[PDB]
Design a protein around this ligand. Structure first.
Ligand SMILES: [Mg+2]
Ligand SMILES: [Zn+2]
Ligand SMILES: [Zn+2]
Lengths: 49, 56, 391, 184, 42, 147, 32, 262, 140, 69, 115
RNA sequence: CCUAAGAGUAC
C-alpha cells in the first residue's frame, strides 16, 4: 500500500512539497495605483531552460 | 514584553475543559492530579494546626 | 482572554478525571466550547491575593458586565431548550416527577406547591415547578409582540412574587439580556442569589429534559410536498424576474440608479431579488414546520440556530457572495468551463438553488466552497486584526 | 472525455462507447488472456484528453454525459439541475467527484454539508487515527497511532476505493444517538 | 500520507479559491491557520 | 469527530445500563448534542447516519458519493421497508427509570474518527520546577515541566 | 453492452477512472 | 400473588416473555441488574510467555478478556478481592493456558477451543469457554504464520458488568411497554400521520387497540412489559433472568441489613 | 372556605391553539348577561365541547368547615371530605389582576400554574373575589 | 486488524462468526445481508460489527516473522 | 491517569457506611438518607415503592453527580410515622414482589419443551 | 543546552 514518491534522508522520509511559482515567458500587464507615476506595467519573467 | 509585561509563572495548570451541569456557577472542576501538583502555602495557626498536621 | 470576564475566580471542586469542569452558563464570558479547548488555572499563594481574588474577581460578581451594563452569563444550550419545553402550557408533571424535580432544587423550602390541577388527577404545570427555582420576591413583567394581560400565545413574561404567572421561559427571560430574570435577580437579591438561581434552574431543567428527551434528525429538515412545491415555484418566479431584469439590461432599456453604473444597478437588483427569494422560501418552510419539529423548537428556544439555518437546510442555501459580490468570472468572461461566455444567469454566477437536504450540484458545490474559503480567510484576518487593535 | 460530432446519431456524443468500457473491464478482470487495454490505450486512440487551465479556458465541458449530451413527471426529492440550453460541448467531465482531493474524497455526502465543514473535515482527517501502513511492525517511526479495529465506513464513496480507504480505514462505525440526554 | 504527497505550497487575494482551481486542486482542503489557501492539495 | 467537522471531546462516559435504549435493546455507542446540528448545518451527518443504518440493516454498502442520484427519500423508503421509522427516529427509553422518552431520538450508525489530541498529552501543572538559566523564569513547554 | 458503439452511462465512467488509477497511481506526479 | 410472567419464546440463548402486574421501576431495575449486576467469569490477568505473532500482547490480552466463559456455578466461586490467598488460588479463579505454534504452511487460527483449563475446578461448572458455532471452533483469538508461536497463561476471576463490560452476560435486552401508546408517554414525531409513519411493534397484537373515541385514561399506570433477554452464553438466559432477580433482592436485603444493624 | 363565586356558564367556543392538552374556552353566564369567562382547561384531563353547560365555582378553600398555600400540599387520604368531591375538575391558582372594565363591570385574572382565567362581571357579585389564592371548581 | 470478539454496542459475541461469514460469502455466493442474517446477527449493531470489519491480519501475516523458531 | 478504579462504583470505601441518615430541618418528620455505592437502579425502585405507601407525604431521590456512585433520598412521612419505618416497609414490599416474580418465572420456564 | 525551520490545536 506504500506508494513511494518520497526520499530517505538520514533515515527520515522527506517529501518535496510542490512549490508554486509564476509561469515564465508570459506577458502580464497590471494597472498601478494613483500615486505612482506609472499607470500600467507590462512585464515578462523571461527565462531560458 | 517577553519577560516583564508578560512572564511565565508558576502554580499554574492548563488542560482541556468539559461541561458539568451538576456544578455551581462559581465552581470549577480540578483534576485530582492537578490538585496534587498545584500547592498553596497555608500559614500554621492555632485555628488550623490539626488539619494541616493531618495533611502533612 | 480578551476581557476581564474571560478571567474569573472560581472555587475548586476536586474531580477524578483529567479535564477541567466548569458550568455551562459560565462558558459564554470565556467564549469556551468543549471541542478541544484548553484553559488555565492560577492559584494565589497568599491570603491577601486569595481574599481580593474572592472579593473582586469572583464569578458571581462578574455576572453583570460593565461592557454593556447587562448580564454576560445566561441559560444556554440544552438548559434553554429544556426550559422552553418545560414552561409550555401542555407540560404537566405527575406527582412522582414533581417530587424528584422539587428535591433537585438545593434551596427548596420543603413545601409541595398545591397542584395547578387538583381533580381528577393532581398535576403540576412546568411553570409551577420552575417557579420554585426562582427566588421569592422577584417581580418581572415583559410584554412581547402582540401579548395582552391574557396570553393567547403564551408569549411575554409575568412573574409575580417569584411565581411565573404566565409566559414561556426562553432566551429573552433567562438569557444574558438586560431586563431579564438574571439581571433582575442580581440587582434585587445580590450576585450570590443569582448564581444560586443559575444552579437551581440548570438542575431542575436538566432533570426534566433528561426524563423527557430531546433530539434532532434528518426528518426535521424535511418540508411536506405542498411546501416543497411552493418553494420550487418561488425559486422559479424569482429566476423569471431575474431573467426579465436581464432582458431589460441587455436591451439597454434598464436605467442606471443614481450613484452607480448600469452593471452595478443590475447586479444590485439581481442580488436583492435572489435574497428575498431565499428569505421567502425559508419563511414558507419555517411556517410549514410544525411545533414538534426539533430544529423549530431549538430556534424558538433561542438556544441554537436561526431562521437562516432552517432556510438553508430545508428551502434554499441562497446566493454565494465573494467580496460582497456574486461569483466572479475567473475564466475569460465565465465562472466555470461548464457555462457559455457572458452567461449572467443565477446558476452561472453562484446561486445555490438546492437546499442542503436535496444536495448541491457540482457547480453549486464549487461556488459554496469558494464562499466558505472567503469566510475562513476573513475569520483569520479578523482575529489577527482584532488582537492587534485590542492590544 | 473527448466529445465528437458523431454524424451517425446526428448529435454530440462521447468518443468513448460501451466497447472501450468492456475492454477496460476485461483488462481489469484479467489483472484481478486478451490484449491489454490500459489508460494509455484510451489516451493513444483519442478517447480522452489532458486539459490544463489555459486550455480549460477555451473549452466547454459537460458535467454529466447522460443528462447533457442528449437533446431535450420528475422526482421532487432529487436536487435541481439544468441542461444549460446549449449543445456545443467539447469535453466531458469523467466524474464531478474528481474535483475533490484525497482528504475530501473521504467525506460522505460532501454536497450536503456547508463548505467550512468540508474544509474542517479535510484538515481533520489527516489527524484521524488508523493504520498508516501494513508494515508498521517493522518500522521504527518516532510516533505511531493505530486503531485496534479499523472499520470501513458504512457510508462509503466510489472515490475512496482508489485511496485504499476500505483496506486501511481511519475510524469506526459507532452507534450515535443525537439527544440532549443528560446535559453532559 | 497521500495528501502530504500531493501537497503544493505557495511562497508569500492569493488565499481565495480561484475559479481556475476547479478540478486541479481540492476546492475544500486547506489549513485553517496562516496557511489558508496558500497550501493546496491536488 | 465525524467525517463532517463535528469535533468534540468526551463529556462523560455512561455504562450500558444508563444509556437510553430502543425497544430492541440497542444502546448508542455515542450521544451527541442536537444543538450541534442546526447552526453548523451538517445535514450530511444526518443523511450518512440514515444511509449507514440502511446499509447495516440490508447488508449492502452505502453509496455516499457526492454528486450521485441518491436521495433522502429513497434511503427513508429502504429504511421503512426494514421495519423501522422512515426518518431514522426510534422510540427510546430512559436508562435511569425505563420510562419512554417523550421525544423520539435520532439513532443510527455513524463513522467517527479518533483524533490525535488526547487529554493525557495535554494535561500539565507546575507548582515549582526548573527555571530558565538567563532570566531565572520558568522554562517553556510541558515536556520540560515548564510554566 | 451488446451494442459495441452504444453510449456509455454515468456508471461506466468510473471504470475509466479505475483504468487511470491502474496506470498513474496516486503519486504519479512525484515519480514521473 | 404479585408480578406475573408469561413467556412467549424459549431458546438456548434468548427468552422472550411478558412481565405483567408489576411497576415500571421494578421492571427497569430488573433490566439494569441483568445488564450490569450479574457476576460472571472472564479472563482478568494475562502472563505472556512467548508471542512471535503480529498482534500486540495487550491486544491479545484484550481479545482473551472478552471470551465468554461458563458461569453456571459461579456463585460457588469467590471474589479475588476477599480471598485469603496471595494473588490467585483455586477457590477464587480459573487458570487457563493458551499455547499455539505455527507449524502449518498455511495460516493457523488460534481459537478459544485451544484454551486448556489448568486449575482443578473442584467439580464446579466454570472455566469452559462457551462454544456456539457448529464448526466447534470458538472465538478466533489470533492467527499464525508458519513458525510463529504464542504461549501465555490466563487467570480468570469472577466479575460483574459494572467493573468491566467483558463480564457482562446479558448482551441486548429488548424492553417495551404500552405498544399502543395508551399511556401517552411518547409524543410521536410525524410529518403527515403518526399512525402511518410509525411501524406497529410486534407486541401490538398482545393488547387491545384504542377505540379512538374513549377519553384518555389518566388513572392508568405502566405494566405488562414485553422483555426479550439474550444470553451471551456464559449462563443460560433463564438463569440470567433468575440471577438478576436474585441480585436485586440481595441489594434490597443488604439495604435492610445495614438499616437494621445501624 | 365558602364559595366566593358560583354560576352556570355555557361554552361558546373552544380554541385548541398550538396545544394538544389545553384549550382556551369562552363562556357566557346563563343567569347574568354581564358575566363572562375565559379559561384554559386541560381538555385531555377534562373534555369540553361547544355548547356545554358548566357549573363554575371559585372558592377560598376546599374544607367544608369554616376557615380557622402556606401549608404543603398532601395527597388526599381515603375518606377525606372536601368540596372537590362535588365537582369534576378542580384547579388551584392565584389572582394577579383586578381590572376596572367599566363603571360596574370588573374583571379578575387568575393563573392556575400557567393556565389563565379571566372572569368579568358586575361588581355586585364579584366583590367577594379578592387578591389571594383560590380554587376553581367545574362540574358538567 | 482482526474480527472483534464482541459487538461494541450490545455485546453479542461475533468473533466466532467471521470464518462462517467468509464461507457463506464464498462457497454459497450469498449476498452480505443474507449471510449476516444466517449467522443470527439480527440487530444492526452486530451487522455493522461483522459487515464493516477489515481483516488486516492477512496483510500483517504476509510479512516474514521477526522471531522464527 | 486520573481515571478512578472501576471497583469504586460498588465497593464501600474504608471508614464509610452503606447508609447515613440526617434529619431534615426544612419540614417536620423528614429525613435525608445517603446511600453509598448505589445508583438509579436501587433509587428508582425504592422511590416507587415508597410512593406506593399511603402515609408517605414525600419521597424522592437524586444522584448529585454521575462521577460518584451515591444518591440522596429524602423521605417525609405523616405525623407519628417514623421515616425509617417507611423505608423498611418499602424494602420489604420490594423483596416480597421480587420473590414472587422469581417463583412465577421459574414456574413458567419449567413449562417449556423447546428450550 | 541554544538557534532556526516545519507541522498542528483553540480562538
Ligand atoms: Mg472550540
Ligand atoms: Zn483465592
Ligand atoms: Zn450487537
Amino acid at each position: 500500500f506504500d506508494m513511494g514518491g518520497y526520499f530517505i534522508i538520514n533515515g527520515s522520509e522527506k517529501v518535496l512539497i510542490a512549490q508554486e511559482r509564476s509561469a515564465g515567458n508570459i506577458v502580464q500587464v497590471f494597472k498601478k495605483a494613483a500615486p505612482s507615476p506609472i499607470s500600467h506595467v507590462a512585464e515578462i519573467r523571461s527565462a531560458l531552460e | 514584553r517577553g519577560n516583564l509585561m508578560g512572564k511565565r509563572v508558576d502554580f499554574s495548570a492548563r488542560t482541556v475543559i468539559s461541561g458539568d451541569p451538576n456544578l455551581e456557577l462559581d465552581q470549577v472542576g480540578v483534576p485530582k492530579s492537578i490538585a496534587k501538583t498545584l500547592t498553596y502555602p497555608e500559614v500554621v495557626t492555632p485555628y488550623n494546626i490539626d488539619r494541616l498536621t493531618q495533611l502533612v | 482572554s480578551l476581557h476581564k470576564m474571560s478571567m474569573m475566580a472560581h472555587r475548586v471542586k476536586v474531580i477524578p478525571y483529567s479535564t477541567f469542569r466548569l458550568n455551562l452558563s459560565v462558558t459564554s464570558p470565556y467564549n469556551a466550547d468543549f471541542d478541544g479547548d484548553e484553559m488555565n488555572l492560577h492559584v494565589p499563594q497568599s491570603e491577601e491575593t486569595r481574599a481580593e481574588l474572592s472579593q473582586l474577581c469572583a464569578v458571581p460578581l462578574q455576572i453583570v458586565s460593565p461592557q454593556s451594563n447587562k448580564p454576560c452569563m445566561g441559560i444556554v444550550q440544552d438548559t434553554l431548550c429544556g426550559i422552553r419545553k418545560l414552561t409550555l402550557r401542555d407540560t404537566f408533571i405527575e406527582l412522582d416527577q414533581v417530587l424528584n424535580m422539587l428535591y433537585w432544587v438545593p434551596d427548596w423550602d420543603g413545601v409541595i406547591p398545591t397542584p395547578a390541577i387538583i381533580k381528577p388527577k393532581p398535576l403540576w404545570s412546568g411553570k409551577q415547578i420552575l417557579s420554585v427555582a426562582i427566588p421569592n420576591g422577584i417581580h418581572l413583567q415583559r410584554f412581547d409582540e402582540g401579548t395582552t394581560l391574557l396570553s393567547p400565545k403564551d408569549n411575554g413574561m409575568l412573574i409575580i412574587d417569584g411565581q411565573i404567572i404566565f409566559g414561556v421561559v426562553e432566551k429573552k427571560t433567562v438569557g444574558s439580556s438586560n431586563g431579564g430574570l438574571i439581571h433582575v435577580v442580581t440587582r434585587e437579591k445580590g450576585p450570590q442569589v443569582c448564581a444560586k438561581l443559575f444552579g437551581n434552574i440548570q438542575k431542575v431543567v436538566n432533570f426534566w429534559l433528561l426524563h423527557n428527551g430531546f433530539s434532532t434528525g434528518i426528518g426535521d429538515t424535511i418540508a411536506d410536498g405542498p411546501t416543497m412545491r411552493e418553494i420550487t415555484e418561488t425559486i422559479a418566479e424569482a429566476k423569471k424576474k431575474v431573467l426579465d431584469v436581464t432582458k431589460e439590461a441587455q436591451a439597454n432599456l434598464l436605467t442606471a440608479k443614481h450613484g452607480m453604473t448600469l452593471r452595478e444597478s443590475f447586479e444590485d437588483n439581481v442580488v436583492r431579488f435572489l435574497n428575498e427569494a431565499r428569505d421567502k422560501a425559508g419563511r414558507l418552510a419555517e411556517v410549514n414546520l410544525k411545533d414538534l419539529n426539533n430544529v423549530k423548537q431549538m430556534v424558538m428556544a433561542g438556544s441554537k440556530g436561526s431562521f437562516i439555518n432552517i432556510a438553508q437546510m430545508s428551502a434554499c442555501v441562497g446566493q454565494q457572495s465573494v467580496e460582497g459580490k456574486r461569483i466572479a468570472f475567473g475564466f475569460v468572461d465565465r465562472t466555470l468551463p461548464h457555462f457559455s461566455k457572458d452567461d449572467y444567469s443565477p446558476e452561472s454566477k453562484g446561486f445555490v438553488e438546492n437546499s442542503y437536504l436535496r444536495g448541491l450540484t457540482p457547480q453549486e458545490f464549487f461556488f459554496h466552497a469558494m464562499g466558505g474559503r472567503e469566510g475562513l480567510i476573513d475569520t483569520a484576518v479578523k482575529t489577527a486584526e482584532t488582537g492587534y487593535i485590542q492590544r | 472525455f473527448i466529445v465528437e460530432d458523431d454524424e451517425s446519431l446526428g448529435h454530440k456524443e462521447l468518443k468513448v462507447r460501451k466497447g472501450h468500457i468492456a475492454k477496460l473491464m476485461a483488462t481489469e478482470y484479467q489483472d484481478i488472456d486478451v490484449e491489454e487495454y490500459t489508460w494509455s490505450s484510451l489516451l493513444n486512440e483519442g478517447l480522452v484528453e489532458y486539459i490544463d487551465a489555459e486550455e480549460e479556458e477555451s473549452i466547454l465541458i459537460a458535467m454529466q454525459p447522460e443528462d447533457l449530451e442528449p437533446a431535450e413527471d420528475v422526482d421532487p426529492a432529487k436536487r435541481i439541475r439544468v441542461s444549460h440550453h446549449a449543445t456545443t460541448f467539447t469535453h466531458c467531465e469523467i466524474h464531478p467527484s474528481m474535483i475533490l482531493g484525497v482528504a475530501a474524497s473521504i467525506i460522505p455526502f460532501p454536497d450536503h454539508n456547508q463548505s467550512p465543514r468540508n474544509t474542517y473535515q479535510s484538515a481533520m482527517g489527516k489527524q484521524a487515527m488508523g493504520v498508516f501502513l501494513t508494515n508498521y511492525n517493522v518500522r521504527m517511526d518516532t510516533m505511531a497511532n493505530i486503531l485496534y479495529y479499523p472499520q470501513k465506513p458504512l457510508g462509503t464513496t466510489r472515490a475512496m476505493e482508489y485511496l485504499k480507504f476500505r483496506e486501511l480505514p481511519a475510524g469506526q462505525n459507532a452507534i450515535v444517538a443525537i439527544a440532549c440526554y443528560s446535559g453532559y | 500520507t497521500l495528501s502530504h504527497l500531493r501537497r503544493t505550497n505557495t511562497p508569500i487575494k492569493p488565499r481565495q479559491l480561484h475559479n481556475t482551481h476547479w478540478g486541479l486542486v481540492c476546492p475544500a482542503e486547506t489549513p485553517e491557520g496562516q496557511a489558508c489557501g496558500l497550501v493546496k492539495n491536488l | 469527530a465525524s467525517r463532517h467537522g463535528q469535533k468534540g471531546t468526551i463529556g462523560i462516559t455512561y455504562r450500558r445500563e444508563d444509556m437510553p435504549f430502543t425497544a430492541e435493546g440497542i444502546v448508542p455507542d455515542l450521544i451527541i448534542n442536537p444543538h450541534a446540528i442546526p447552526s453548523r448545518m451538517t445535514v450530511a451527518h444526518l443523511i450518512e447516519c440514515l444511509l449507514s443504518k440502511v446499509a447495516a440493516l440490508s447488508g449492502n454498502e452505502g453509496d455516499a458519493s457526492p454528486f450521485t442520484d441518491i436521495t433522502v427519500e429513497g434511503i427513508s423508503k429502504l429504511l421503512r421497508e426494514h421495519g423501522y421509522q422512515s426518518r431514522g427516529f426510534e422510540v427510546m427509553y430512559n436508562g435511569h427509570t425505563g420510562k419512554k422518552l417523550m421525544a423520539q431520538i435520532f439513532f443510527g450508525p455513524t463513522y467517527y474518527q479518533r483524533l490525535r489530541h488526547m487529554v493525557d498529552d495535554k494535561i500539565h501543572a507546575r507548582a515549582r520546577g526548573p527555571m530558565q538559566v538567563l532570566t531565572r523564569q520558568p522554562v517553556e513547554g510541558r515536556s520540560r515541566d515548564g510554566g | 453492452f451488446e451494442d459495441e458503439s452504444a453510449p456509455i452511462t454515468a456508471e461506466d465512467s468510473w471504470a475509466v477512472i479505475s483504468a487511470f488509477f491502474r496506470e498513474k497511481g496516486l503519486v504519479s506526479q512525484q515519480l514521473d | 400473588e404479585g408480578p406475573q410472567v408469561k413467556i412467549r419464546e424459549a431458546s438456548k440463548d434468548n427468552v422472550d416473555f411478558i412481565l405483567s402486574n408489576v411497576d415500571l421501576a421494578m421492571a427497569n431495575s430488573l433490566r439494569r441488574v441483568m445488564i450490569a449486576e450479574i457476576p460472571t467469569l472472564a479472563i482478568d490477568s494475562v502472563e505472556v510467555e512467548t508471542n512471535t505473532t503480529v498482534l500486540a500482547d495487550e491486544f491479545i490480552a484484550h481479545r482473551l478478556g472478552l471470551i465468554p466463559l461458563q458461569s453456571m456455578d459461579i456463585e460457588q466461586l469467590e471474589y479475588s478481592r476477599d480471598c485469603f490467598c496471595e494473588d490467585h488460588c483455586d477457590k477464587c479463579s480459573v487458570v487457563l493456558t493458551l499455547q499455539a505454534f505455527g507449524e502449518s504452511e498455511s495460516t493457523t487460527n488460534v481459537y478459544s477451543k485451544d484454551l486448556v483449563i489448568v486449575s482443578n475446578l473442584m467439580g464446579r461448572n466454570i472455566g469452559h469457554p462457551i462454544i456456539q458455532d457448529k464448526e466447534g471452533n470458538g472465538v478466533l483469538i489470533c492467527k499464525l504464520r508458519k513458525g510463529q508461536e504464542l504461549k501465555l497463561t490466563c487467570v480468570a476471576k469472577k466479575g460483574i458488568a459494572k467493573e468491566h463490560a467483558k463480564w457482562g452476560p446479558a448482551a441486548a435486552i429488548e424492553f417495551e411497554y404500552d405498544p399502543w401508546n395508551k399511556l401517552k408517554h411518547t409524543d410521536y414525531w410525524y410529518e403527515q400521520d403518526s399512525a402511518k409513519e410509525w411501524p406497529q411493534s410486534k407486541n401490538c397484537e398482545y393488547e387491545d387497540p384504542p377505540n379512538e373515541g374513549d377519553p384518555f385514561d389518566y388513572k392508568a399506570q405502566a405494566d405488562t412489559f414485553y422483555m426479550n433477554v439474550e444470553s451471551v452464553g456464559s449462563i443460560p438466559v433463564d438463569q440470567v433472568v433468575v440471577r438478576g432477580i436474585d441480585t436485586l433482592q440481595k441489594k434490597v436485603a443488604s439495604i435492610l441489613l445495614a438499616l437494621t444493624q445501624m | 372556605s365558602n364559595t366566593l363565586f358560583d354560576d352556570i356558564f355555557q361554552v361558546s367556543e373552544v380554541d385548541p391553539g398550538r396545544y394538544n392538552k389545553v384549550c382556551r374556552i369562552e363562556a357566557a353566564s346563563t343567569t347574568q348577561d354581564q358575566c363572562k369567562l375565559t379559561l384554559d382547561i386541560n381538555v385531555e384531563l377534562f373534555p369540553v365541547a361547544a355548547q356545554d353547560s358548566l357549573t363554575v365555582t371559585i372558592a377560598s378553600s376546599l374544607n367544608l368547615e369554616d376557615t380557622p398555600a402556606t401549608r404543603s400540599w398532601r395527597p388526599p387520604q381515603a375518606g377525606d371530605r372536601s368540596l372537590a368531591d362535588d365537582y369534576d375538575y378542580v384547579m388551584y391558582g392565584t389572582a394577579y389582576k383586578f381590572e376596572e372594565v367599566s363603571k360596574d363591570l370588573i374583571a379578575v385574572y387568575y393563573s392556575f400554574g400557567g393556565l389563565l382565567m379571566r372572569l368579568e362581571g358586575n361588581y355586585r357579585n364579584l366583590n367577594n373575589l379578592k387578591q389571594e389564592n383560590a380554587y376553581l371548581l367545574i362540574r358538567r | 486488524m482482526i474480527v472483534p470478539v464482541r459487538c461494541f454496542s450490545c455485546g453479542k459475541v461475533v468473533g466466532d462468526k467471521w470464518e462462517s461469514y467468509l464461507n457463506l460469502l464464498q462457497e454459497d455466493e450469498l449476498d452480505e445481508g443474507t449471510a449476516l442474517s444466517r449467522l443470527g446477527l439480527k440487530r444492526y449493531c452486530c451487522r455493522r460489527m461483522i459487515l464493516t470489519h477489515v481483516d488486516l491480519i492477512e496483510k500483517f501475516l504476509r510479512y516474514n516473522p521477526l522471531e522464527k523458531r | 491517569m486520573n481515571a478512578p478504579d472501576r471497583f469504586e462504583l460498588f465497593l464501600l470505601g474504608e471508614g464509610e457506611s452503606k447508609l447515613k441518615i440526617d434529619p431534615d430541618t426544612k419540614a417536620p418528620n423528614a429525613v435525608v438518607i445517603t446511600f453509598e455505592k448505589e445508583d438509579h437502579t436501587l433509587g428508582n425502585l425504592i422511590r416507587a415503592e415508597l410512593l406506593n405507601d399511603r402515609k408517605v407525604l414525600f419521597a424522592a431521590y437524586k444522584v448529585e453527580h454521575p462521577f460518584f456512585a451515591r444518591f440522596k433520598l429524602r423521605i417525609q412521612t405523616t405525623e407519628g410515622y417514623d421515616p425509617k419505618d417507611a423505608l423498611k416497609n418499602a424494602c420489604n414490599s420490594i423483596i416480597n414482589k421480587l420473590g414472587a416474580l422469581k417463583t412465577n418465572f421459574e414456574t413458567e420456564w419449567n413449562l417449556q419443551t423447546l428450550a
